[PDB]
């Protein structure tokens, strides 16, 4: 599980692999339904739906 502050994994003698998360493949863009809340999971899961 990669958190929002990134991840580091190393394997063997080779270089440590850095990784970083992103603003996901699907969400819900600017749409005629409600269609923000799935997007509003992509940034900030498990929080800020709490202020909803």
């Amino acid at each position: 599980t990669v958190p929002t502050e990134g991840l580091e994994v190393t394997w063997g003698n080779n270089e440590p692999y850095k990784y970083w998360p992103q603003m996901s493949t699907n969400g819900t863009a600017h749409g005629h339904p409600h269609e923000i809340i799935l997007y509003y999971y992509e940034l900030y899961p498990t929080m800020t739906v709490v202020i909803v």
């Binding site: 970083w20 600017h30 923000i36 940034l43 800020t48």
Partner: protein
Amino acid sequence: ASHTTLGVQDISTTAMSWVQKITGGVGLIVAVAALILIVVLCVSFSRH
């Protein structure tokens, strides 16, 4: 990419317009009903 950092007060095309829709208070007009109550009550409610 730290440079695209994000706070909290953030802007969609439409989110705050739906907030503008959902800020459609009715407590103002029922407070206006409370004011018409206190001014009918002003028949004998003129000091407090």
